[PDB]
C-alpha cells in the first residue's frame, strides 16, 4: 500500500493519539506507581495490541526513496528497511 | 520579516528624505504611488517565474495571455499555431 | 557543448516538447523512461518510441528545421540533460 491511501492516513492519526497517551502516561506510570492498581490492566492491554496492530500494518507499508526519487515497492526491501531501522 | 515590513521601511527612509528637504505634496504623492507599486507583489512575476521549467510556464502564459495578444490587429496570420508560439 | 548543459527533473503527467511550437531546448535522457508521440491525423496520439537509457530527442528537429516530429511526455520521474 502506497501511504498516500485515505485508510493508511486516518489509522496514522489514531495511531498519533495512542502514541500521546502512551508518551504522556510511561513517565507517570514509572515514578507515581510501583506495580499498578487493578483498575488499570484493559488500557495497557489494548495499548499494547494497538501498537503491535502498528507493527504489522507497518511490515506492509510502502515508501518512497530518497536518493533515486522513485517510490519503491519490493516487498523484501521495505521489510530490510523496518527491520534495519 | 515580510514585504508589509520593506515597505514601510523604505517609506519611511523617503519619508525622512523628504521631509528633510522640505520638497512639496505633489512629488510626494508621485513618490507614493511610485514606492507602492514597485512593493507589492505584482512587480516580482517575472521575477519568480524565470525556474520553472517552461513547460508550465508555456500553459500559464497560454491561458493568462492568450486573448490580449489574440485581439491585436497586427497579428491576423491566422495560425492559431503561430499566435501559439 | 558539455560545458553548456544543465538537469532537470520532471514528474510524471508533464510533456517536456510539443509537437507543434518549435524546439529551443534538445534535452538528452540519462535516467528515467519517457514516450514519443507524434500527433496522430486519425485525431489521437498513439505511441513511437519509448526513450530510457542514454538517447536524446529535439536534435532531428535541429537538422530538419522544421517542427518537432513527435509530442513527448514523461512517463515516471526522468533525470534529462538540456542544451538550447
Redesign the interface.
Request: glycine share 0%; aromatic share 0%.
Given at each position: 500500500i502506497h501511504p498516500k491511501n485515505r485508510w493508511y492516513k486516518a489509522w496514522e492519526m489514531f495511531i498519533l493519539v495512542w502514541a500521546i497517551y502512551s508518551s504522556l502516561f510511561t513517565p507517570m506510570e514509572f515514578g507515581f506507581f510501583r506495580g499498578l492498581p487493578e483498575r488499570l490492566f484493559v488500557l495497557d492491554i489494548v495499548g499494547q495490541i494497538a501498537f503491535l496492530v502498528d507493527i504489522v500494518l507497518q511490515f506492509f507499508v510502502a515508501y518512497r526513496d530518497t536518493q533515486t526519487y522513485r517510490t519503491v515497492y519490493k516487498p523484501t526491501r521495505i521489510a530490510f528497511r523496518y527491520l534495519k531501522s | 520579516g515580510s514585504n508589509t515590513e520593506r515597505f514601510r521601511d523604505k517609506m519611511n527612509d523617503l519619508i525622512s528624505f523628504m521631509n528633510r528637504k522640505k520638497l512639496g505634496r505633489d512629488l510626494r504623492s508621485q513618490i507614493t504611488g511610485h514606492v507602492r507599486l514597485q512593493y507589492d507583489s505584482h512587480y516580482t512575476d517575472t521575477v519568480m517565474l524565470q525556474d520553472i521549467?517552461?513547460?508550465?510556464r508555456?500553459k500559464i502564459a497560454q491561458l493568462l495571455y492568450l486573448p490580449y495578444i489574440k485581439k491585436v490587429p497586427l497579428f491576423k496570420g491566422c495560425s492559431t499555431?503561430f499566435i501559439?508560439? | 557543448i558539455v560545458i553548456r548543459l544543465h538537469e532537470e527533473y520532471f514528474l510524471p503527467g508533464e510533456v517536456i516538447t510539443e509537437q507543434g511550437n518549435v524546439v529551443d531546448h534538445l534535452y538528452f535522457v540519462c535516467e528515467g523512461l519517457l514516450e514519443a508521440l507524434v500527433t496522430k491525423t486519425d485525431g489521437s496520439e498513439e505511441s513511437v518510441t519509448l526513450l530510457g537509457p542514454h538517447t536524446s530527442f529535439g536534435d532531428i528537429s535541429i537538422i530538419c528545421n522544421i517542427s518537432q516530429p513527435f509530442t513527448v511526455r514523461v512517463c515516471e520521474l526522468c533525470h534529462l540533460l538540456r542544451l538550447d
Open positions: - | 521549467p517552461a513547460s508550465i508555456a499555431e501559439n508560439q | -
